[PDB]
């Protein structure tokens, strides 16, 4: 049984420290850009279809069908299509930064469709009250609607992070970096039973933690 303790600790430490570092930066940075640009687009989807602040049937229809296309079109295939544009922006095709770019594009379009829920669900009459007191549309969104759905936004970001984790592992085998780029080396190929149980353990503890953080804050911010 001690075979298991020795086989991992001696070699794997040296790689694990980098494989982890690559993983965190790739999830974190992609998430930030996804939540940022996804917010603005989600707002546009809502405010064009709101028919209260403003309206445009056509722009609403165009933006929805765009968002639909991009949400459903396959991510791995999109990354292969995005290699020239990616290299031209990043200055290279390989590394966590380049993956973070394509991840962020998927996450951008992913985010906004969620937030559509977050707005259609909200109580009507306070909108009429804001309009009754003559605020600019920008003030209504900026300094009302978020706080009212504040608990809703915490949940959405929590679930997006968990999604991007699975996506980052898929992104890493082709582009390099991440625990996926480890797992394919010690599973699928040169498979080792003991090394695989250690990666599984690390994931479990990390993914409880992020969710438990999310639920505690969301609960605090009712």
């Amino acid at each position: 049984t001690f075979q298991q303790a020795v086989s991992t600790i001696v070699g794997m430490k040296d790689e694990i420290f980098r494989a982890l570092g690559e993983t965190f930066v790739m999830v974190g940075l992609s998430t930030t850009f996804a939540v940022i640009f996804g917010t603005l687009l989600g707002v546009l989807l809502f405010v064009t279809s709101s028919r209260q602040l403003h309206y445009n049937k056509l722009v609403n229809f165009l933006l929805d069908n765009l968002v639909n296309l991009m949400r459903a079109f396959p991510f791995v295939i999109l990354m292969i299509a995005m290699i020239p544009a990616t290299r031209a922006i990043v200055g290279s095709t390989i590394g966590p930064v380049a993956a973070s770019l394509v991840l962020s594009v998927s996450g951008l379009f992913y985010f906004a469709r969620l937030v559509e829920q977050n707005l259609r669900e909200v109580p009507k009459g306070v909108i009429e009250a804001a309009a009754a007191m003559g605020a600019p549309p920008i003030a209504i969104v900026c300094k009302v609607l978020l706080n009212e759905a504040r608990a809703g936004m915490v949940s959405s970001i929590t679930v997006l992070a968990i999604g991007l984790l699975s996506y980052s592992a898929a992104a890493g085998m082709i582009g390099g970096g991440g625990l996926g780029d480890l797992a394919i080396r010690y599973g699928y190929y040169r498979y080792q039973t003991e090394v695989i149980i250690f990666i599984v353990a690390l994931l479990v503890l990390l993914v409880i933690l992020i969710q438990s953080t999310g639920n505690a804050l969301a609960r605090k911010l009712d």
Binding site: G125, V126, E128, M133, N147, E148
Partner: protein
């Protein structure tokens, strides 16, 4: 303050809250409290929204402090909206901000100086007394408090007209006696021209100047309530009095 005209109408199974609001017009004079009365719903539970143009009518036009409103662009309509106060059948507030902060909210939209907001909220909170539990949230307090929150929210920006929708009438009469005393002072000092809806006679006789009595999106009568006496002439008016 005058209407030119208004109406708004609905097809079978078009089905908004009520059947049609008919061709109608009125003048409400300066420094005057004007009451609205009649059986429930009937477009009367809506009619006041048309004054603040919160429903666009199917017909007609309205003038308020000179300006005709229906022709206005939205950015001009903001100032018309800002100067006219309203309060409602439901409490219509920002759940996740405190009571005092809900009271600050319209004054944030007024763009008032931070200390002007702070002073005005402390003033209006104290005028209604609820400064004593203003650092508070809607689960913590009751509907009675929440009425005073509506009142203060409407009051604070010194609007030139108030368009009450049964806010003070919403409480039971015994509780109402202690609050009605407030509105009297507000009118005497600032000539607020306050317009009110009701389905109870008692409050009118103890507060108002003229009453429109109503049914089917239309007038039954307009009556003087002066002398604490409603000088009506129709039997429908007599039923509404009882």
């Amino acid at each position: 303050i005058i209407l030119d005209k208004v109406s708004k109408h609905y097809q079978t199974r078009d089905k908004t809250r009520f059947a049609a609001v008919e061709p109608t017009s009125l003048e409400i004079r300066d420094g005057e409290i004007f009451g609205l009365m009649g059986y429930s719903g009937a477009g009367k539970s809506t009619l006041l929204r048309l004054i603040n143009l919160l429903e666009r009518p199917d017909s007609g036009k309205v003038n308020v402090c000179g300006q005709e409103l229906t022709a206005l662009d939205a950015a001009a309509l903001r100032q018309a909206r800002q100067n006219i106060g309203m309060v409602f059948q439901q409490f219509n507030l920002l759940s996740n901000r405190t009571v005092a902060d809900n009271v600050a909210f319209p004054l944030e939209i007024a763009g008032w100086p931070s200390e002007k907001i702070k002073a005005r909220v402390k003033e209006c909170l104290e005028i209604v007394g609820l400064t004593e539990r203003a650092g508070h949230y809607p689960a913590q307090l009751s509907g009675g408090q929440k009425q005073r929150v509506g009142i203060a929210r409407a009051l604070a920006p010194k609007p030139q007209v108030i368009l009450a929708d049964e806010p003070t009438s919403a409480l039971d009469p015994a509780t109402t006696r202690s609050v009605l005393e407030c509105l009297e002072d507000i009118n005497k000092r600032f000539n607020v021209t306050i317009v009110i809806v009701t389905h109870e006679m008692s409050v009118i006789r103890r507060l108002c100047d003229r009453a429109a009595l109503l049914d089917k999106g239309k007038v039954v009568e307009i009556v003087e309530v002066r002398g604490n006496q409603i000088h009506a002439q129709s039997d429908i008016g007599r039923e509404l009095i009882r």
